[PDB]
Design a protein around this ligand. Structure first.
Ligand code: LYS
Ligand code: LYS
Ligand code: MG
Ligand code: MG
Ligand code: MG
Ligand code: MG
Lengths: 296, 296
């Protein structure tokens, strides 16, 4: 299978005056490129995918593709939806506009059965000829892609090559790679990046890397080389920031940190997302002082 | 406050050859009207709101309004979204096209904070002058509107008059009406319709009423008239069907039952929803046999 692995970033989507700041978006990519990141994910959960229009979603994918041309960095485009017809539409757009692959979150809100999840992802995978990474995040979607369904999809669909797990379930990570060691398990939870990688996971799709791309990149590449002492030391050092970046729903803390670091101009979200509490704003600022944040 | 209460049905959306069957939709609503229902909810969770287009969503609202015109039966239009700007757009459409009020599910997938939920619903409520019913279903959305937030919205926003609770939490139902007895608590879980009504809830938004509108409307009306003995009797009798209609994610079992009863032409879902397993198909059919199903 064709694959997209390594250190990857779930890009925030900056706003200015309520619209996507397209110049800031491109500048934030490139900063990721220049700090060792292997792939970028435009318009995932961290990118406020649910509140962008379909037009804005597509614009962000195009900016990511244009910014990564001439580099090794790959574009793994967010293309998920609760509706299969909408997910297929985004998948085809990403393919026709030069993305290297797609990420596709399990349908949220409507809680499809495992049979429905299989048919959902089969239709997505059959619609394009680029790699497809599944994405399981039950705390957000209200459903789980079972290990059996993930493995069936990997084995049955040529371009489905693995899963991004955000489920706090290392047992399932063992289950997945013990029964199907050819898949690419990707960590979707920064605090446990190292345990997932050390069980044979092959990359991360990170929130923390928005702020600390060099540290997440080094952690991942140490682990892929089986330099587990060095990978664990970075994972341990990052624990405090990894947890404070979820003191409120992601991406509220990460955008707060990017603003405090002067990496975005305004602390702007699209409703129903909004600024953190005053107390949490101060907690994020405090934890940040313990880390070296690269500029532009 | 202007209110919409009583026995209400979360209408299924029948499909024919992948498109909304608009004549079937009107026929099913007339059947609800002839069996005592007080209001209908077009395009809620049970109506596959997540996979309809915005244009099909609007068409179903218009059919409900037209079919109910000249009856006493109100239309409480589904108008929720994870994106506040989309929810405001649906609310304004429902107002402009003659709906009596709107239902608005808590934003799913992006997990807004309580402050965000407050600002989301404030924006919706300020955009129209018709009643607004909140809707809490954390197993689907991944978030919970707290009792404090619900009560604040009820008190601060003239249009917001209550909440549809689908949370399996009778403690919260007591909390709500003990601290704010003026709100309209609406049951969103059929199996516990009577316990919610007997604590002072003032209506139901039912799945089961798609199949048995006469039984759900009688249950509600007994309870509102303080005949708890007869209300509980129907609630008890309905437990088996109320539970089997959730053996797979709603609306998979209810559409299966409507098809088995000859009330819709074809067992058609929009992906990622799909037919139940053969075992669950047979179990739904078996449970239905103990109930008398009204025809057209
Ligand atoms: N609010 C809709 C539309 C998002 C479209 C852009 N990804 C949803 O969550 O599916
Ligand atoms: N699939 C999108 C669009 C649905 C529009 C009609 N309710 C969502 O879940 O928000
Ligand atoms: Mg290229
Ligand atoms: Mg996605
Ligand atoms: Mg009546
Ligand atoms: Mg709704």
């Amino acid at each position: 299978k064709n694959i997209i692995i390594g250190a990857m970033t779930a890009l925030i989507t900056p706003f200015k005056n309520g619209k996507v700041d397209e110049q800031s978006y491109a500048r934030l990519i490139k900063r990721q490129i220049e700090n060792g990141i292997d792939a970028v994910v435009p318009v995932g959960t961290t990118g406020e995918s649910a509140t962008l229009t379909h037009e804005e979603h597509r614009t962000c994918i195009e900016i990511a593709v244009e910014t990564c041309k001439g580099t090794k960095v790959k574009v793994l485009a967010g293309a998920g939806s609760a509706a299969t017809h909408e997910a297929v539409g985004l998948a085809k757009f990403a393919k026709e506009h030069g993305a290297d692959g797609i990420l596709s979150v399990a349908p949220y809100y409507n809680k499809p059965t495992q049979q429905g999840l299989y048919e959902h992802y089969k239709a997505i995978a059959q619609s394009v000829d680029i790699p497809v990474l599944l994405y399981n995040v039950p705390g957000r979607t209200g459903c789980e892609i079972s290990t059996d369904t993930i493995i069936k999809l990997f084995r049955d669909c040529e371009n489905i090559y693995g899963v991004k797990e955000a489920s706090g379930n290392i047992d399932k990570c063992v289950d997945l790679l013990a029964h199907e060691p050819r898949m690419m398990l990707i960590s979707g939870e920064d605090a446990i990046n190292y345990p997932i990688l050390s069980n044979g996971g092959k990359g991360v799709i990170s929130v923390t890397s928005n702020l600390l791309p060099d540290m997440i990149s080094a952690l991942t590449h140490f682990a892929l080389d089986e330099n587990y002492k060095e990978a664990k030391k970075i994972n341990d050092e990052l624990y405090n920031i990894n947890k404070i970046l979820f003191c409120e729903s992601n991406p509220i803390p990460i955008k707060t940190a990017m603003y405090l670091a002067g990496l975005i101009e305004s602390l702007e979200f699209r409703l129903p997302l909004c600024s953190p509490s005053k107390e949490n704003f101060a907690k994020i600022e405090e934890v940040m002082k313990k880390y070296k944040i690269k500029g532009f």
